Design an enzyme around this catalytic site. Sequence first.
Site, PDB file in Angstrom:
ATOM      1  CG  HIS A 125      36.571  14.079  13.489  1.00 19.90           C
ATOM      2  ND1 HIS A 125      36.932  15.265  12.840  1.00 19.90           N
ATOM      3  CD2 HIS A 125      37.713  13.341  13.648  1.00 19.90           C
ATOM      4  CE1 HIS A 125      38.243  15.221  12.615  1.00 19.90           C
ATOM      5  NE2 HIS A 125      38.713  14.085  13.083  1.00 19.90           N
TER       6      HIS A 125
ATOM      7  CG  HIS B 164      40.600  12.798  17.364  1.00 17.00           C
ATOM      8  ND1 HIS B 164      41.445  13.916  17.305  1.00 17.00           N
ATOM      9  CD2 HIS B 164      40.238  12.442  16.099  1.00 17.00           C
ATOM     10  CE1 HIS B 164      41.552  14.230  16.012  1.00 17.00           C
ATOM     11  NE2 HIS B 164      40.864  13.352  15.258  1.00 17.00           N
ATOM     12  CD  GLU B 165      38.845   9.467  15.078  1.00 17.50           C
ATOM     13  OE1 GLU B 165      38.362  10.211  14.242  1.00 17.50           O
ATOM     14  OE2 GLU B 165      40.135   9.203  15.177  1.00 17.50           O
TER      15      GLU B 165
ATOM     16  CG  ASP C 116      46.448   8.329   1.197  1.00 12.38           C
ATOM     17  OD1 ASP C 116      45.822   8.702   2.179  1.00 12.38           O
ATOM     18  OD2 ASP C 116      45.964   7.562   0.270  1.00 12.38           O
TER      19      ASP C 116
ATOM     20  CE1 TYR D  75      46.109  14.557  11.492  1.00 10.53           C
ATOM     21  CE2 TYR D  75      44.624  14.234  13.382  1.00 10.53           C
ATOM     22  CZ  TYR D  75      45.033  13.899  12.093  1.00 10.53           C
ATOM     23  OH  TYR D  75      44.370  12.898  11.421  1.00 10.53           O
TER      24      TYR D  75
ATOM     25  CD  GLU E  34      36.826  11.657  10.937  1.00  6.04           C
ATOM     26  OE1 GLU E  34      37.692  10.837  11.225  1.00  6.04           O
ATOM     27  OE2 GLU E  34      37.048  12.735  10.229  1.00  6.04           O
TER      28      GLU E  34
ATOM     29  CD  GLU F 132      41.753  15.106  11.589  1.00  5.40           C
ATOM     30  OE1 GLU F 132      41.645  14.906  12.797  1.00  5.40           O
ATOM     31  OE2 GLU F 132      41.137  14.356  10.719  1.00  5.40           O
TER      32      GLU F 132
HETATM   33  C1  LIG Z   1      44.789  12.093  16.383  1.00  4.27           C
HETATM   34  C2  LIG Z   1      44.128  10.851  16.946  1.00  4.27           C
HETATM   35  C3  LIG Z   1      43.099  11.151  18.016  1.00  4.27           C
HETATM   36  C4  LIG Z   1      43.578   9.851  15.925  1.00  4.27           C
HETATM   37  C5  LIG Z   1      44.016   9.901  14.482  1.00  4.27           C
HETATM   38  N1  LIG Z   1      42.805   9.786  13.679  1.00  4.27           N
HETATM   39  C6  LIG Z   1      42.271  10.885  13.112  1.00  4.27           C
HETATM   40  O1  LIG Z   1      42.737  12.024  13.218  1.00  4.27           O
HETATM   41  C7  LIG Z   1      40.977  10.596  12.340  1.00  4.27           C
HETATM   42  O2  LIG Z   1      39.958  11.435  12.845  1.00  4.27           O
HETATM   43  C8  LIG Z   1      41.249  10.963  10.870  1.00  4.27           C
HETATM   44  N2  LIG Z   1      39.993  11.161  10.192  1.00  4.27           N
HETATM   45  C9  LIG Z   1      42.129   9.928  10.169  1.00  4.27           C
HETATM   46  C10 LIG Z   1      42.377  10.164   8.689  1.00  4.27           C
HETATM   47  C11 LIG Z   1      42.943  11.350   8.228  1.00  4.27           C
HETATM   48  C12 LIG Z   1      43.244  11.527   6.877  1.00  4.27           C
HETATM   49  C13 LIG Z   1      42.971  10.516   5.967  1.00  4.27           C
HETATM   50  C14 LIG Z   1      42.382   9.329   6.415  1.00  4.27           C
HETATM   51  C15 LIG Z   1      42.077   9.172   7.752  1.00  4.27           C
HETATM   52  C16 LIG Z   1      45.003   8.722  14.168  1.00  4.27           C
HETATM   53  O3  LIG Z   1      46.180   8.821  14.462  1.00  4.27           O
HETATM   54  O4  LIG Z   1      44.510   7.685  13.568  1.00  4.27           O
HETATM   55 ZN   LIG Z   2      40.614  13.359  13.312  1.00  3.72          ZN
END
Ligand SMILES: CC(C)C[C@H](NC(=O)[C@@H](O)[C@H](N)Cc1ccccc1)C(=O)O
Ligand SMILES: [Zn+2]
Length: 610
Positions: free
Chosen positions: A299, A295-296, A375, A383, A271, A318
């Site tokens: 955010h 999703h994005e 990480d 989520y 996002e 999330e």
């Molecule tokens: C759940 C899905 C709609 C998409 C998901 N992406 C996300 O949740 C993004 O909004 C997150 N912001 C991805 C993220 C989380 C923690 C650290 C770095 C990056 C993904 O799996 O990449």
């Molecule tokens: Zn997200």
Amino acid sequence: PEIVDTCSLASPASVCRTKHLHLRCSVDFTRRTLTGTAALTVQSQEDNLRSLVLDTKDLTIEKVVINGQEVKYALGERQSYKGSPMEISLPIALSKNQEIVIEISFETSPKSSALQWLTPEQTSGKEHPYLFSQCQAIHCRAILPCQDTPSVKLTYTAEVSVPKELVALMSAIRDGETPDPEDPSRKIYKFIQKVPIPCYLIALVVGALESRQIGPRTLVWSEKEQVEKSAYEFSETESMLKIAEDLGGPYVWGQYDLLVLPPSFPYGGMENPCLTFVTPTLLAGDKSLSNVIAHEISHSWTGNLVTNKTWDHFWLNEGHTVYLERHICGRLFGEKFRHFNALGGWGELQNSVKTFGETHPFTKLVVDLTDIDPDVAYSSVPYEKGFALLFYLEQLLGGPEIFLGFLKAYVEKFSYKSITTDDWKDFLYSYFKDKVDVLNQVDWNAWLYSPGLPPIKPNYDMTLTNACIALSQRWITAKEDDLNSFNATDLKDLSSHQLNEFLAQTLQRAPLPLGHIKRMQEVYNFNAINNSEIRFRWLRLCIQSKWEDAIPLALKMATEQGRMKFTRPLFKDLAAFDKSHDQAVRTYQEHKASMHPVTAMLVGKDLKVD
Ligand SMILES: CC(C)C[C@H](NC(=O)[C@@H](O)[C@H](N)Cc1ccccc1)C(=O)O
Ligand SMILES: [Zn+2]
Ligand SMILES: [Yb+3]
Ligand SMILES: [Yb+3]
Ligand SMILES: [Yb+3]
């Protein structure tokens, strides 16, 4: 009542707060460096503020200037994943609400965890390099010195010099483009970000980008070879934006652009404000993976407007976002579809809990990341346990309509702020003052602080799920005498969404007898499917079911793209398969140098290499 960001080494928001960042820098692809100055406008919250601490990681500091004069500074020793604390000496004691501006002369490491520098070979075009950042959760510090915490929000402006032939984009409004004048063969790109944001939302990409406009507030950006398909894939964006506005109130960022990155992008989506980054793995050719887009977009309210104060409350970001996401999809495709997606999320949650173990601290909704690298703790828990809590509350308090009202109010109430689980819950009780009695029926302790599956499972419509279950159960319980009757007709009225869910369900009971898996390819030709979600799950099933022929397929998918969601478990499965183990390890070793840095670190860990 002090809350600590156990992931930052910087001075906390209760001491000082960065309000703005003026960034002027140049992208050196030959040296794989970002060089420049970070002018930070800082505001004291204390009287007599004489020195502050900033977060850094693999940063090379040239000088630190304040009021045209260089100042004293120090770099403490590295604290592993947190990088190294940078202490700065203020030439004037500061008092509450007073501000100074600190200009920092820095150079990034080519090994910056926030970045991935691609050789032209690694690109689609093959003729130019490419650079992309990824700061969330705590990698901003790997690009420039800052209070690398979501508890602080700032505005920012930046000018970035890049090779005339390449394009630069940021998570901001493109302000203008002009040739540099400095014995160079670069261009100077301008951006402005008027909305205060947490630093993890700072983003940059440089490459041979082209764009296509697909909405009034949206252009699709990617290398030439991906433009057209992206343009098709994400056609629904504007309509999504409109739903989201209806759900959360006005979209305040102005532009809603998209960037389809190269395959090694580690996430499905990110996002970044004004410029959402997405994996090319979303290009299924049928728009079927657009939920990531929904999703994005979401955010832009839950995460970007109202931000988790520390990563311990990451579920606020999330969980609310998945909730919105699902509403967007339910709106575009049907309430039954929303339910389907919701129930499948519960399934992902069961998998995560099984994976970590039901007593594992990372299975709690609210976690304590002291000494843990984000990480590394990352999972589906925030989520899915987050989404389940919200879905459950929606059911308990009256329904979607009623709950969405709470949601829009919450967004309004906390816009531009960074908050915690308590602020959210305290607000919830306040909004629902008329229903405290209902609220009190929830087992908050278990939901917020207990590990494992939630204390209660919400109710779900089974319409679209039923075909999935019938089918997976048939396969899971099949006997020799059932094999011959399976047939492609079995897939007749199943959408790609249902095929995926069928596989997810099947996968939960792996391994299946090898003969069954073979029959399955024979009757459904899943090998032929290019949709990433489906292939990912199909290949896992195959590997876990010990099908050797699937080895090369799994290795290929794992290395040809680098979305962690697929890459990590493919590598892990292959390493767990006696037959492909050695080769899995060897492939990684061979690919590591060319991989994204965080992915690389995680896979090595996963593989127990090093
Ligand atoms: C759940 C899905 C709609 C998409 C998901 N992406 C996300 O949740 C993004 O909004 C997150 N912001 C991805 C993220 C989380 C923690 C650290 C770095 C990056 C993904 O799996 O990449
Ligand atoms: Zn997200
Ligand atoms: Yb130097
Ligand atoms: Yb240098
Ligand atoms: Yb039978």
